[PDB]
Amino acid sequence: SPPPCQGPIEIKETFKYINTVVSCLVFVLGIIGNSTLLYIIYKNKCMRNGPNILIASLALGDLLHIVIAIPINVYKLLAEDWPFGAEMCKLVPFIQKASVGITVLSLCALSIDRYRAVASWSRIKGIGVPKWTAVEIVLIWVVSVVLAVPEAIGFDIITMDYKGSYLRICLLHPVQKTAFMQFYATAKDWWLFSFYFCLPLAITAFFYTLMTCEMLRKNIFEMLRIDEGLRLKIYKDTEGYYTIGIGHLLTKSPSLNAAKSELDKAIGRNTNGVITKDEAEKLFNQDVDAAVRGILRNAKLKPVYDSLDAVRRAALINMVFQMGETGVAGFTNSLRMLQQKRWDEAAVNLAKSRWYNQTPNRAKRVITTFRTGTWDAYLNDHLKQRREVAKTVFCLVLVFALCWLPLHLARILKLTLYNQNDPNRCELLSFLLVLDYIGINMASLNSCANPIALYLVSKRFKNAFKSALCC
Template identity: 50%
Template structure:
């Protein structure tokens, strides 16, 4: 019996709890602010921005439902929430990841189409096509998460003299489909939820780069340069996604391929995998709150909009100075002056009214 993994679990209880609290607070504030910025301004309701808003909504649902329950389960070890939440929590988590993955794919296509003026959906208006995209993203994400509802169950076991209730993907699945899902789940998640969006982005951004290189940079219009800047912002979101999820998938795949229960050195190897697994879980949790931060860092206009949004929340509580009022007014006038008929993340007034 390996004793070291138990000590690692006890140590990571406090680390995971601290990270979960951080994700919960920052994630709610950041994603709510992002949704407010997009919804409060008509000029912000462009295709890519609405997709980003949909992504933020998926993250917000995951943060509110999953983070508190998973944190309690880690601390208490027992599962007191019943069968419904046992099935709901992994379902919401997989749905949220699916929304993130498919939204990033849709944003990559949208940026390619915008930069190279590829318009094969001319028959549909931007808002109508975006509504179709978002509906498909949510329906597909919900559908792909259904096996979590079917497979997760509660079991009871005795551990150190305690009678524990545990929520997990049941080791004995009744249907042939669920047996296949359980045996191949790690590879399915790695392939579809990690490799696919990276490959998708690489393909469309390579095509976009080839198209852009054919044009002289001095000959590019201001509008094309703005679209290119937005493409860089979307690419940044994809990189953040990859960095956040790579440790967890790497841990699961390595454990699946090289871990042997009969190996005499398995305890040391299991300890390494467990540390990597907990680190990966924390990094994956951070992805739910980091997108608003990434947008704040890479987008000047979003940074100004976020500050204005915080200012609007603060105004009812305290009087704003003349300098602050003039600063906000100047920001709005600059945004209005820079408006053009083509909407994008970095070319419009993002302030919260």
């Protein structure tokens, strides 16, 4: 039997003041933001697509979480009591974990949907809400609800005499009745850390990484499409040679039939000299892989290519597409400047070349890419859209991680540091109370923060919030 403590368990009033001000701000701001987000999505037929319906599910989860988590924990902090009976003792943490499930599974679903939007070539572009997304969301909600059931079984009101005074305490009571519930009581906080924090962080980081890798390939395609054109019919390049797609040389033979037979071989069907954009994109991706393999077999180009970031690598591939491996190797001083990361110097030197004199528009764009390491010289609607999708996913995931980490660390610290035999353990318990109430406020700040992140990252949402709130 554990000894009593030598010191008190208490929460200082100054902390109660600060924490309650934060709670009220998160509550008011979170209800307004997520309600306005939902109204934006419902009111505008232009806002009802795959991802925004998933965002609607996230926003509903935000509202559910804020309403179930903040008021009851403000009350516990100030009243230090439980007047609501056993049924509410079970229902509140049940609904609370259901709403966390909806939040994290909706975030996961959004990261997968945004990846699919970049990677799928057969996805029909348009305003529709796919059949599967409707069942996707129902499953998210059913699963979130089922996974929260142990909270409703395990929580209950117990009574104790504590140094004279009778207390009624709502908690996940020790001594659960079945083997499963006993295990849940001991593992719950590792379960929440694993399934509701680590696992969605791993899933969204994985799909975000797949998505940004794919966006890099799309950007190289768009860059060379701007500089060399996408030609779906066989044409003759500046030297007279039959070519197709994005500068894909078919043959140097003067026979159009010979070019057609090569084309049919590379595509695997009878094209009669005409291919689809998807076919040209696959051809282009192979041409890029081949150009890269050649760059890495070239002792003058490999050191430079290795040292460059992914964007500047694309500019180098761009020059190799235009003038071949041997021509690019001729820029000896410019390649050295690039390898030493003297961007502005390399940019001024490249503009003094015969290459710039012959194709100045293209060279200016490639040089801007070398100078800045950005895609700015190739900005079009597809690039603006990709930047925004990337920033949306990154920001939602990062704010999730930062907001929810404190509450998990609070529960893990108790698991790892609390020694029930220590007569001084109530100083740790008093500290954990502070971390816990902070953790609740930070977790609810996530629900409050999601509408704000969309406002700042998405021009479409920014203007939608303006119409709904500033008018």
